[PDB]
Paper text:
We crystallized the POT1C–TPP1PBM complex and determined its structure by single-wavelength anomalous dispersion (SAD) at a resolution of 2.1 Å. The TPP1PBM polypeptide forms an extended structure that wraps around the surface of POT1C. Although primary sequence analysis failed to identify any known protein motif in POT1C, the crystal structure reveals a typical OB-fold architecture comprising a highly curved five-stranded β-barrel at one end of POT1C. An unbiased search for structurally homologous proteins using Dali42 revealed unequivocal structural resemblance of POT1393–538 with archaeal Holliday junction resolvase Hjc. Notably, there is a zinc ion between the OB fold and the HJRL domain of POT1, which is coordinated by four cysteine residues contributed by both POT1OB3 and POT1HJRL. This zinc ion helps stabilize the relative orientation between POT1OB3 and POT1HJRL. Consistently, Dali search revealed that the structure of POT1OB3 is most similar to that of the C-terminal OB (OB3) fold of TEBPα2742. Four hydrophobic residues in helix H1 of TPP1PBM, Leu271, Ala275, Leu279 and Leu281 make intimate interactions to the POT1 groove. Taken together, we conclude that although all three binding modules contribute to the POT1-TPP1 interaction, the first module is essential for the binding.
Human telomeres are protected by a specialized six-protein complex, shelterin. Here we use structural and biochemical analyses to show that the C-terminal half of POT1 contains two domains, a third OB fold separated by a Holliday junction resolvase-like domain.
Numbering used by the authors:
A (entry chain A): 341 to 613, 619 to 634
B (entry chain B): 264 to 316
The structure:
């Protein structure tokens, strides 16, 4: 009834901060390599970070595999422990600690594992069969998180990371403080360990063109715009294909801007200290499938 | 009981690779593109340029 759209030339003549309903074509976007759009964002200190690569994680886990699991830290009231020996793996030993709920192991799909000496591959397989996995190491008096460079919790396809700056890391026995040992809410796990969890976000820079003007607008969101969770996309091939196809739909390489579809959205202007713009309250995924 | 515990131990063991050569795991196409593009420039926006609340 009252749907009206502001031309870009109008927006560029105005002062920030304001909000605008627009319609424009995506002339171009960054990043060209779409995997680089997935960033980690601390809600506490507002820092943006890269997600560690496979190679980075492999280094950490292999380095963990050089250390011998401490027998003193095995089979507590919190968890049952099992050690596997290996062959042709530099004498590696894997410890899996099965976390109990009130002195009883729950069903596998509700059971949290703590692992010493496991590979990323093994951890990811364990995460399919169990509720979740925390990579750990044998500290002086308790099990401790392996490294904040690696995920503090792998649950399903989500690799949860914590902020190195804002976190005050606490040892594994502090998981006793969780209300149950069957739900394993990531934020609750983080709080128990003194971890400030990082948030996954899609960060992109869109160059929008409606034929009256041109404007650079940022995308920054977790799951609204694509209706694809940024927390899952890096570990899910189908969700990656969806992001590829959506970007290919709005800004197909090679062909001319005349043929592109229109992007209906809101943008907010704001003062950095120059005026920047950012998409908000917008999804492409409600009308596209 | 220990038989439920035993079951979880077997499930854990099934996910481990304790012998032979530790083969490379099958990776998604973004992660494959990521591995290839190592060394090149990484897209980055400073957080102060973004509007966060
Ligand atoms: Zn932080």
């Amino acid at each position: 009834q009252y749907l009206e759209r502001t031309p870009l030339c109008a927006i560029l003549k105005q002062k920030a901060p304001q909000q605008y309903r627009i319609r424009a074509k995506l002339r171009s976007y960054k990043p060209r390599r779409l995997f680089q759009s997935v960033k980690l964002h601390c809600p506490k200190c507002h820092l943006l970070q890269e997600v560690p690569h496979e190679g980075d994680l492999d280094i950490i886990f292999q380095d963990g595999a050089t250390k011998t699991p401490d027998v003193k830290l095995q089979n507590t009231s919190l968890y049952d422990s099992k050690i596997w020996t290996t062959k042709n793996q530099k004498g590696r030993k894997v410890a899996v600690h099965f976390v109990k709920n009130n002195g009883i192991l729950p069903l596998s799909n509700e059971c949290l594992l703590l692992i010493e000496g496991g590979t990323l591959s093994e951890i990811c397989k364990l995460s399919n069969k169990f509720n979740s996995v925390i990579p750990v190491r044998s500290g002086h008096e308790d099990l401790e998180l392996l490294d904040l460079s690696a995920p503090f919790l792998i649950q399903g396809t989500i690799h949860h990371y914590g902020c190195k700056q804002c976190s005050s890391l606490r040892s594994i026995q502090n998981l006793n403080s969780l209300v149950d040992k069957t739900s394993w809410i990531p934020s609750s796990v983080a709080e128990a360990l003194g971890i400030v969890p990082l948030q996954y976000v899609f960060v992109m820079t869109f160059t929008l063109d409606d034929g009256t003007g041109v404007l650079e607008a940022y995308l920054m969101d977790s799951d609204k715009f694509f209706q694809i969770p940024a927390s899952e996309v890096l570990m899910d091939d189908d969700l990656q294909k969806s992001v590829d196809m959506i970007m290919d739909m709005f800004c197909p390489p090679g062909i001319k801007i005349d043929a592109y579809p229109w992007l209906e959205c809101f943008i907010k202007s704001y003062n950095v200290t120059q005026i920047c713009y950012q998409i908000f309250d917008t999804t492409v995924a409600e009308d596209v499938i | 009981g220990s038989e439920h515990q035993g079951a979880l131990v077997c499930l854990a063991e099934s996910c481990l690779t304790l012998e032979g050569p530790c083969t490379a795991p099958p990776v998604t196409h973004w992660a494959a593109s990521r591995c290839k593009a190592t060394g090149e420039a990484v897209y980055t926006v400073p957080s102060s340029m973004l509007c966060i609340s």
